[model samples]
Target: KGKLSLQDVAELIRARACQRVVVMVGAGISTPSGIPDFRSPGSGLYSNLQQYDLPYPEAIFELPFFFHNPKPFFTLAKELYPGNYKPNVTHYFLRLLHDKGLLLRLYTQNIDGLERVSGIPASKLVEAHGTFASATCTVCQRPFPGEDIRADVMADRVPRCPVCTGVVKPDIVFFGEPLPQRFLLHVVDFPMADLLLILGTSLEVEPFASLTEAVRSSVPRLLINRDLVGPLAWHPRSRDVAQLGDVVHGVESLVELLGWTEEMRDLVQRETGK
Candidate 1:
């Protein structure tokens, strides 16, 4: 007797369309741009690895495994690093959100750093897993310019910090590594959102996964992904959850209902050239 319909969700967004909109995104949002989803069995990146000889999928991002033998990570980074893929329509959709001044913040789990390429202002993004935007000495934690390490990433070799000659790695949050300091600083930001848009993630991982629950009960949450997520999708008393699927498609539908389809299409084609 108490579930949210798409129209109900659309009307809620319209009511708060001019307010702060916080969008949280993940890997699946980039799949339309030809990047594979990280956890899709057989088709996802984590499932089809052979060259690195990992003991497990998480080992590839494990700091202990990385420092013990960086070849596997660097080898994999040759393809995973930024500049490997172009921003997709999904990314442009967020850019449009910022252009309209409705974006409160974008909390993202991707390390690819496509938000920048999509022209989303740096002031608007929080790379929750950290990003290839910069690198740092693994031992000293001293930062290095991201561009400076391109050669090492492209060559399947470990980068070294000039200060101490220690290994330098792009500042992604590896397994068993603490999240970036920035994440903790803004952990309180989600609940303050007027609108929370969850996109593309399965919500299986911790911290980021629990963020949906952090929103104000009075606010509306729209979960758009290829597969519908759990618990948050159907909260008993909270009308905040709107379990929609597919980022590009769900966003398109929302724009139509709100009468912004033309502008949405324009931004998507400009970003994606399609």
Candidate 2:
């Protein structure tokens, strides 16, 4: 049952003013910054993975596949890794919430590390799909500096683990792999949350998608997305507010609809200016 207009939701956000707002975002938030989601139609990165010649689509992120031949993964990592792209307005809107002391925690499925660059403090973030910020050895499980393996990635070669000579992989969680422990441990607190913002994700995958259930639907969850995807696709009784459109346009619309004294247009401009 649709309960509110985007404007009504905007009013709720403004009224809550600085209240804890938990967020769950995905690759769609970063698409405006020149990145494409893995599951997007046609030009989506996953559809183009034919070059990898794997048994299935998920094999690209399969743990055994990476161990057997890490080149394909590294080849793509050179493009997927952090620092090359800028964060979009959606990222800034959340960061703006944080600056105003409203953000409770951001659980992101993206490994792009754009949220961090947007100035969101680590304390307020949980990278559900682990970011490109760091790497660890597969054998000894010792952590490696992001730059070291990154250099190997850009060179299209695999970095060996220092402790046990096994290859190294970035912190991005593979398909067959378990997610970061922090995501699992921290999710329990979301059910008692004040408000929820579900952004730019299909809720297509598990664990991250399971968060729809982790947090009570009664917490006034809102989904700002490009089309009817994820939670919106669920049962007719779903309670989260839905505003469909591109992430940037959706955010700009919300910011304006709120009639906030502070402007998001300039805030985003000032943020990416650096």
Largest lDDT belongs to which candidate? 2
Highest-TM-score candidate? 1
Please, what is the whole-model Cα lDDT of each candidate in the order they appear? 0.76, 0.77
TM-score of each: 0.87, 0.86
Model 2 lDDT per residue over 1-274, tens place: 5575677777777887427788889888988888887777787767877775555567667788888777777766787776678888888889888987888888888888899989999878898878777898888889976887877787777888867898888888887577677775455658656777888886777766666766665667788887776645674234567788877788877888877526676787777778
Give me the runs in candidate 1 sitting further than 4 Å from their true place. 1-18, 234-238, 241-243
Deviation (Å) of 52 in candidate 2: 5.6
Listed per candidate, the RMSD to the true structure in angstroms reads: 2.6, 2.9
Error of 2 at 274 (Å): 3.2
Q: Which stretches of candidate 2 lie over 4 Å from their true place?
A: 50-56, 214-218, 232-239, 260-262
Report the Cα lDDT for candidate 2: 0.77
Q: For residues 103-168, could you state the per-residue lDDT of candidate 1 as single tens digits?
A: 888988887788888898777888888887788898888988788899878876688888899999
